[PDB]
């Protein structure tokens, strides 16, 4: 071991997960099509927006149902998940607006919200065997993606940015220190922790964290079947196909992030298998779910595979890079997913001639 990228270093903490300047210029100068126009975010006065306050003390996510897995929803639940949901949506939106407009005001709005969370030591005190552990990986990554686009902005409170960066670094070091179970060590959850470590590693210039994130991608490549299916996701019965796709989201972000540090994770393979195999399996299995039957007998839940679903955000990044065809015809309306950097359409999509 330990893995091939365990000497990699963060070359540029400001490089983010897209070329921010080049994309901004393109958006202002290029021939936009209707789809891309539909993705431009709307400006607003973020300075007066009420943003969620963090949970004080122990981070606890309430059980969803009063009793069992049917019953009526726990009234304590929604207000709590709404905190995190709004946190993620506002973060991604402000990040996307900063990329699209270049206006420092959006950076300052984001920093004010994140500083409020950092001051409370949010996303740090929780039971690792609880739902909180997953929530942290999603929220920390969402904020880090958005902040990463603004690391080079001179016109902000630089002390505040530092303080927020260091807090995110502590959050990720702590969150990733728990090795996980027999599944969550190694399945899609591992990859989500990998995207968190990778992007936070970059913005805080923490090579250890960065390397750890890259290692999750390498781990993933070793768990791909000959047909492109991920070993652990094919054990999810009626959700197997759904989780095959779900795993593509953070693996893609790891690869996009690493590429701006000069590392080409897309080219990384084990036993001649790579992420491209996984992509082909998803497309193939969607248009022929008999492929899945080799692994699971249940009819597959396909709610993820509809136009506009955030679950499809990874396709925008990969397609922009490799130019393969939209074989499923999914890429009609824009896609927005805060947990994978906001709108892949806004950030990566290039209209075809």
Short mmCIF file of C-alpha atoms in Angstrom, two decimals:
data_model
loop_
_atom_site.label_atom_id
_atom_site.label_comp_id
_atom_site.label_asym_id
_atom_site.label_seq_id
_atom_site.Cartn_x
_atom_site.Cartn_y
_atom_site.Cartn_z
CA UNK A 1 0.00 0.00 0.00
CA UNK A 2 -1.04 2.35 1.15
CA UNK A 3 -2.37 3.69 -2.17
CA UNK A 4 -0.85 5.21 -5.38
CA UNK A 5 -1.79 8.79 -4.45
CA UNK A 6 -0.46 8.78 -0.90
CA UNK A 7 2.23 11.35 -1.75
CA UNK A 8 -0.09 13.71 -3.68
CA UNK A 9 -0.17 17.32 -2.52
CA UNK A 10 -2.57 20.22 -2.73
CA UNK A 11 -0.98 22.45 -5.35
CA UNK A 12 -3.54 25.27 -5.23
CA UNK A 13 -6.13 25.77 -2.46
CA UNK A 14 -7.98 28.25 -4.69
CA UNK A 15 -8.44 25.93 -7.69
CA UNK A 16 -11.90 24.72 -6.61
CA UNK A 17 -13.78 22.05 -8.56
CA UNK A 18 -14.29 24.05 -11.75
CA UNK A 19 -12.30 26.77 -13.43
CA UNK A 20 -14.29 29.64 -11.89
CA UNK A 21 -12.89 32.52 -13.96
CA UNK A 22 -13.08 30.63 -17.29
CA UNK A 23 -16.61 29.49 -16.65
CA UNK A 24 -17.75 32.94 -15.60
CA UNK A 25 -16.26 34.41 -18.75
CA UNK A 26 -17.92 31.77 -20.89
CA UNK A 27 -21.31 32.46 -19.30
CA UNK A 28 -20.98 36.17 -20.08
CA UNK A 29 -19.57 35.83 -23.65
CA UNK A 30 -20.74 32.55 -25.18
CA UNK A 31 -23.69 31.52 -27.27
CA UNK A 32 -26.06 30.26 -24.55
CA UNK A 33 -28.83 27.82 -25.38
CA UNK A 34 -32.20 27.65 -23.66
CA UNK A 35 -31.14 25.02 -21.18
CA UNK A 36 -28.12 26.99 -20.02
CA UNK A 37 -30.16 30.22 -19.86
CA UNK A 38 -32.68 28.38 -17.68
CA UNK A 39 -29.81 27.54 -15.30
CA UNK A 40 -28.61 31.11 -14.60
CA UNK A 41 -29.36 31.74 -10.92
CA UNK A 42 -31.41 34.82 -10.00
CA UNK A 43 -29.76 37.57 -8.08
CA UNK A 44 -31.23 38.71 -4.79
CA UNK A 45 -30.27 40.66 -1.69
CA UNK A 46 -28.62 37.96 0.34
CA UNK A 47 -27.57 40.50 2.98
CA UNK A 48 -31.12 40.57 4.44
CA UNK A 49 -31.89 36.85 4.07
CA UNK A 50 -32.56 34.96 7.29
CA UNK A 51 -30.24 31.99 7.39
CA UNK A 52 -30.54 28.96 9.65
CA UNK A 53 -28.94 29.02 13.06
CA UNK A 54 -26.92 25.94 14.04
CA UNK A 55 -28.01 23.39 16.65
CA UNK A 56 -26.29 24.11 19.95
CA UNK A 57 -24.80 21.33 22.00
CA UNK A 58 -25.09 17.79 20.68
CA UNK A 59 -26.12 17.45 17.07
CA UNK A 60 -29.17 15.22 17.11
CA UNK A 61 -31.41 14.20 14.23
CA UNK A 62 -34.87 13.13 15.54
CA UNK A 63 -36.39 9.80 14.49
CA UNK A 64 -38.70 10.32 11.51
CA UNK A 65 -41.81 8.49 12.69
CA UNK A 66 -43.57 8.54 16.02
CA UNK A 67 -43.64 4.74 15.90
CA UNK A 68 -42.18 2.26 13.42
CA UNK A 69 -41.62 3.06 9.75
CA UNK A 70 -45.24 3.99 8.89
CA UNK A 71 -47.24 5.88 11.53
CA UNK A 72 -47.41 9.68 11.56
CA UNK A 73 -44.26 11.81 11.18
CA UNK A 74 -42.50 12.91 14.31
CA UNK A 75 -43.30 16.64 14.67
CA UNK A 76 -39.77 17.23 16.06
CA UNK A 77 -38.21 15.87 12.82
CA UNK A 78 -38.96 18.34 10.01
CA UNK A 79 -37.78 21.48 11.84
CA UNK A 80 -34.41 19.81 12.36
CA UNK A 81 -33.84 18.46 8.86
CA UNK A 82 -35.11 21.77 7.52
CA UNK A 83 -32.17 23.45 9.24
CA UNK A 84 -29.74 21.35 7.24
CA UNK A 85 -31.70 21.41 4.08
CA UNK A 86 -31.83 25.23 4.08
CA UNK A 87 -28.16 25.42 5.08
CA UNK A 88 -27.27 23.31 2.03
CA UNK A 89 -29.55 25.10 -0.39
CA UNK A 90 -28.44 28.58 0.57
CA UNK A 91 -24.76 27.54 0.55
CA UNK A 92 -24.97 26.05 -2.97
CA UNK A 93 -27.02 28.95 -4.26
CA UNK A 94 -24.58 31.56 -3.00
CA UNK A 95 -21.65 29.59 -4.41
CA UNK A 96 -23.33 29.34 -7.81
CA UNK A 97 -24.22 33.07 -7.75
CA UNK A 98 -20.60 33.95 -6.98
CA UNK A 99 -19.39 31.92 -9.91
CA UNK A 100 -22.01 33.39 -12.30
CA UNK A 101 -21.68 37.08 -11.30
CA UNK A 102 -18.33 37.49 -9.62
CA UNK A 103 -19.96 39.81 -7.05
CA UNK A 104 -18.19 39.71 -3.68
CA UNK A 105 -21.45 40.37 -1.87
CA UNK A 106 -22.44 36.71 -2.40
CA UNK A 107 -19.13 35.59 -0.92
CA UNK A 108 -19.76 37.76 2.14
CA UNK A 109 -23.25 36.41 2.61
CA UNK A 110 -21.87 32.85 2.57
CA UNK A 111 -19.06 33.67 4.97
CA UNK A 112 -21.51 35.31 7.42
CA UNK A 113 -23.66 32.21 7.54
CA UNK A 114 -20.72 29.77 7.81
CA UNK A 115 -19.03 31.92 10.46
CA UNK A 116 -22.19 31.64 12.58
CA UNK A 117 -21.98 27.83 12.31
CA UNK A 118 -18.20 27.78 12.94
CA UNK A 119 -18.56 29.91 16.08
CA UNK A 120 -21.06 27.42 17.48
CA UNK A 121 -18.74 24.48 16.80
CA UNK A 122 -21.51 23.01 14.57
CA UNK A 123 -21.12 19.56 12.92
CA UNK A 124 -18.64 18.38 15.57
CA UNK A 125 -20.48 16.96 18.57
CA UNK A 126 -22.56 13.94 17.72
CA UNK A 127 -22.91 10.18 18.07
CA UNK A 128 -21.04 8.61 15.09
CA UNK A 129 -23.45 5.66 14.95
CA UNK A 130 -26.36 8.03 14.43
CA UNK A 131 -27.87 9.66 11.35
CA UNK A 132 -25.86 12.74 12.36
CA UNK A 133 -22.69 11.20 10.98
CA UNK A 134 -24.12 11.14 7.43
CA UNK A 135 -25.68 14.58 7.75
CA UNK A 136 -22.27 16.05 8.58
CA UNK A 137 -20.62 14.61 5.47
CA UNK A 138 -23.37 16.10 3.24
CA UNK A 139 -23.49 19.51 4.84
CA UNK A 140 -19.76 20.00 5.29
CA UNK A 141 -19.13 19.07 1.66
CA UNK A 142 -21.92 21.34 0.40
CA UNK A 143 -20.52 24.39 2.21
CA UNK A 144 -16.94 23.51 1.19
CA UNK A 145 -17.80 23.28 -2.50
CA UNK A 146 -19.46 26.67 -2.35
CA UNK A 147 -16.60 28.28 -0.35
CA UNK A 148 -13.95 26.74 -2.61
CA UNK A 149 -15.10 28.95 -5.51
CA UNK A 150 -14.30 32.05 -3.41
CA UNK A 151 -10.92 31.20 -1.98
CA UNK A 152 -9.22 33.71 -4.33
CA UNK A 153 -11.70 36.60 -3.72
CA UNK A 154 -9.69 39.51 -2.19
CA UNK A 155 -12.68 41.54 -1.18
CA UNK A 156 -13.92 39.70 1.89
CA UNK A 157 -13.10 39.62 5.55
CA UNK A 158 -10.02 37.44 5.28
CA UNK A 159 -9.87 36.64 8.99
CA UNK A 160 -13.44 35.36 8.82
CA UNK A 161 -12.63 33.18 5.77
CA UNK A 162 -9.65 31.64 7.64
CA UNK A 163 -11.74 30.94 10.68
CA UNK A 164 -14.41 29.23 8.52
CA UNK A 165 -11.79 27.22 6.63
CA UNK A 166 -10.19 25.95 9.82
CA UNK A 167 -13.60 24.97 11.21
CA UNK A 168 -14.37 22.93 8.06
CA UNK A 169 -10.97 21.29 8.35
CA UNK A 170 -11.78 20.26 11.97
CA UNK A 171 -15.22 18.98 10.91
CA UNK A 172 -13.77 16.75 8.16
CA UNK A 173 -10.85 15.43 10.21
CA UNK A 174 -13.25 14.44 12.95
CA UNK A 175 -16.04 13.03 10.62
CA UNK A 176 -13.58 10.94 8.59
CA UNK A 177 -11.80 9.58 11.68
CA UNK A 178 -14.62 7.07 12.27
CA UNK A 179 -13.82 4.02 10.12
CA UNK A 180 -17.44 2.94 9.50
CA UNK A 181 -19.10 -0.51 9.60
CA UNK A 182 -18.78 -3.57 7.38
CA UNK A 183 -20.74 -1.80 4.66
CA UNK A 184 -20.28 1.91 5.42
CA UNK A 185 -16.50 1.49 5.53
CA UNK A 186 -16.46 0.69 1.83
CA UNK A 187 -19.68 1.45 -0.01
CA UNK A 188 -21.12 4.73 -1.31
CA UNK A 189 -21.01 6.30 2.17
CA UNK A 190 -17.22 5.88 2.04
CA UNK A 191 -17.19 7.77 -1.26
CA UNK A 192 -19.28 10.58 0.20
CA UNK A 193 -16.73 10.89 3.02
CA UNK A 194 -14.08 10.86 0.28
CA UNK A 195 -15.59 13.87 -1.55
CA UNK A 196 -15.83 15.73 1.78
CA UNK A 197 -12.18 15.05 2.60
CA UNK A 198 -11.02 15.86 -0.90
CA UNK A 199 -12.63 19.30 -1.28
CA UNK A 200 -11.95 20.35 2.34
CA UNK A 201 -8.40 19.03 2.00
CA UNK A 202 -7.92 21.35 -0.98
CA UNK A 203 -9.30 24.57 0.54
CA UNK A 204 -7.47 24.15 3.84
CA UNK A 205 -4.29 22.93 2.16
CA UNK A 206 -4.28 19.75 4.22
CA UNK A 207 -2.39 17.12 2.22
CA UNK A 208 -3.26 14.32 4.66
CA UNK A 209 -6.98 14.91 4.21
CA UNK A 210 -6.61 15.34 0.46
CA UNK A 211 -4.76 11.98 0.19
CA UNK A 212 -7.34 10.28 2.33
CA UNK A 213 -10.12 11.44 -0.01
CA UNK A 214 -8.27 10.25 -3.11
CA UNK A 215 -7.85 6.91 -1.39
CA UNK A 216 -11.63 6.46 -1.27
CA UNK A 217 -11.80 6.75 -5.04
CA UNK A 218 -9.04 4.10 -5.40
CA UNK A 219 -10.92 1.91 -2.93
CA UNK A 220 -14.05 2.32 -5.08
CA UNK A 221 -12.29 1.20 -8.29
CA UNK A 222 -11.31 -2.05 -6.58
CA UNK A 223 -14.97 -2.79 -5.86
CA UNK A 224 -16.32 -2.68 -9.39
CA UNK A 225 -17.56 -5.88 -11.02
CA UNK A 226 -16.67 -6.90 -14.56
CA UNK A 227 -19.98 -5.46 -15.83
CA UNK A 228 -19.40 -2.08 -14.15
CA UNK A 229 -21.67 -2.68 -11.13
CA UNK A 230 -20.39 -1.71 -7.65
CA UNK A 231 -20.12 -4.74 -5.39
CA UNK A 232 -21.71 -3.15 -2.33
CA UNK A 233 -24.52 -1.36 -4.14
CA UNK A 234 -25.73 -4.58 -5.81
CA UNK A 235 -26.75 -5.84 -2.32
CA UNK A 236 -29.52 -3.22 -1.89
CA UNK A 237 -32.36 -5.26 -3.36
CA UNK A 238 -34.91 -2.95 -4.94
CA UNK A 239 -32.59 0.05 -4.41
CA UNK A 240 -29.57 -1.53 -6.06
CA UNK A 241 -29.77 0.47 -9.26
CA UNK A 242 -30.57 3.63 -7.30
CA UNK A 243 -27.42 3.20 -5.19
CA UNK A 244 -25.26 2.36 -8.22
CA UNK A 245 -26.20 5.79 -9.46
CA UNK A 246 -25.88 7.39 -6.01
CA UNK A 247 -22.26 6.28 -5.73
CA UNK A 248 -21.46 8.08 -9.03
CA UNK A 249 -22.14 11.46 -7.42
CA UNK A 250 -19.27 11.75 -4.94
CA UNK A 251 -16.84 9.69 -7.10
CA UNK A 252 -17.37 12.24 -9.84
CA UNK A 253 -16.74 15.18 -7.50
CA UNK A 254 -13.58 13.56 -6.17
CA UNK A 255 -12.37 13.17 -9.77
CA UNK A 256 -13.36 16.75 -10.78
CA UNK A 257 -11.68 18.22 -7.69
CA UNK A 258 -8.49 16.17 -8.08
CA UNK A 259 -8.17 17.09 -11.75
CA UNK A 260 -7.60 20.75 -10.83
CA UNK A 261 -4.72 19.61 -8.63
CA UNK A 262 -3.21 17.94 -11.71
CA UNK A 263 -4.33 14.39 -10.93
CA UNK A 264 -6.36 12.41 -13.43
CA UNK A 265 -8.44 10.02 -11.40
CA UNK A 266 -10.61 9.23 -14.40
CA UNK A 267 -7.58 7.41 -15.87
CA UNK A 268 -7.16 5.36 -12.73
CA UNK A 269 -8.10 1.68 -13.07
CA UNK A 270 -7.79 -1.65 -11.23
CA UNK A 271 -8.06 -4.93 -13.16
CA UNK A 272 -8.92 -2.89 -16.24
CA UNK A 273 -12.06 -1.55 -14.54
CA UNK A 274 -12.69 2.18 -14.08
CA UNK A 275 -15.42 4.72 -13.54
CA UNK A 276 -16.36 4.62 -17.17
CA UNK A 277 -17.44 0.97 -16.73
CA UNK A 278 -19.66 2.09 -13.88
CA UNK A 279 -21.22 4.86 -15.97
CA UNK A 280 -21.98 2.41 -18.82
CA UNK A 281 -23.58 -0.02 -16.41
CA UNK A 282 -25.94 2.67 -15.13
CA UNK A 283 -27.06 3.72 -18.63
CA UNK A 284 -27.36 0.12 -19.77
CA UNK A 285 -29.26 -1.03 -16.71
CA UNK A 286 -31.68 1.89 -16.84
CA UNK A 287 -32.74 0.92 -20.38
CA UNK A 288 -32.68 -2.79 -19.56
CA UNK A 289 -33.24 -3.58 -15.90
CA UNK A 290 -32.87 -7.26 -16.67
CA UNK A 291 -29.16 -6.53 -16.21
CA UNK A 292 -29.85 -6.07 -12.52
CA UNK A 293 -31.56 -9.43 -12.14
CA UNK A 294 -28.17 -11.04 -11.99
CA UNK A 295 -27.86 -9.42 -8.54
CA UNK A 296 -31.38 -8.64 -7.31
CA UNK A 297 -34.79 -10.13 -8.08
CA UNK A 298 -36.88 -7.16 -6.94
CA UNK A 299 -38.18 -4.72 -9.53
CA UNK A 300 -35.98 -1.66 -9.28
CA UNK A 301 -37.05 1.67 -7.78
CA UNK A 302 -36.24 4.21 -10.56
CA UNK A 303 -37.46 7.47 -9.00
CA UNK A 304 -33.93 8.86 -9.40
CA UNK A 305 -34.03 8.59 -13.15
CA UNK A 306 -36.15 11.54 -14.23
CA UNK A 307 -35.26 14.90 -15.77
CA UNK A 308 -34.40 17.54 -13.15
CA UNK A 309 -33.47 15.03 -10.43
CA UNK A 310 -30.36 16.13 -8.51
CA UNK A 311 -29.21 12.50 -8.49
CA UNK A 312 -28.20 13.10 -12.14
CA UNK A 313 -25.84 16.03 -11.44
CA UNK A 314 -22.74 13.86 -12.00
CA UNK A 315 -23.67 13.35 -15.67
CA UNK A 316 -23.29 17.06 -16.35
CA UNK A 317 -19.68 16.99 -15.14
CA UNK A 318 -18.73 13.78 -16.90
CA UNK A 319 -20.44 14.67 -20.12
CA UNK A 320 -18.75 18.06 -20.23
CA UNK A 321 -15.43 16.25 -19.87
CA UNK A 322 -15.86 13.22 -22.13
CA UNK A 323 -18.58 14.24 -24.56
CA UNK A 324 -20.50 10.95 -24.52
CA UNK A 325 -24.12 10.91 -25.63
CA UNK A 326 -27.17 11.53 -23.39
CA UNK A 327 -28.40 8.00 -24.17
CA UNK A 328 -31.22 8.19 -21.67
CA UNK A 329 -32.55 11.57 -22.80
CA UNK A 330 -32.43 12.85 -19.21
CA UNK A 331 -30.51 16.05 -19.76
CA UNK A 332 -33.37 18.31 -20.70
CA UNK A 333 -34.08 20.64 -17.79
CA UNK A 334 -31.21 22.02 -15.64
CA UNK A 335 -30.00 19.90 -12.69
CA UNK A 336 -29.32 21.38 -9.23
CA UNK A 337 -27.81 19.40 -6.37
CA UNK A 338 -26.28 21.31 -3.47
CA UNK A 339 -24.31 18.24 -2.27
CA UNK A 340 -22.42 18.03 -5.54
CA UNK A 341 -21.63 21.70 -6.01
CA UNK A 342 -25.02 23.13 -6.95
CA UNK A 343 -26.01 23.29 -10.60
CA UNK A 344 -23.88 21.02 -12.78
CA UNK A 345 -25.73 22.60 -15.73
CA UNK A 346 -24.61 26.14 -14.78
CA UNK A 347 -21.08 25.04 -13.98
CA UNK A 348 -20.12 22.48 -16.63
CA UNK A 349 -22.70 22.10 -19.41
CA UNK A 350 -21.57 23.23 -22.88
CA UNK A 351 -24.19 23.64 -25.61
CA UNK A 352 -23.44 21.42 -28.61
CA UNK A 353 -23.14 22.80 -32.15
#
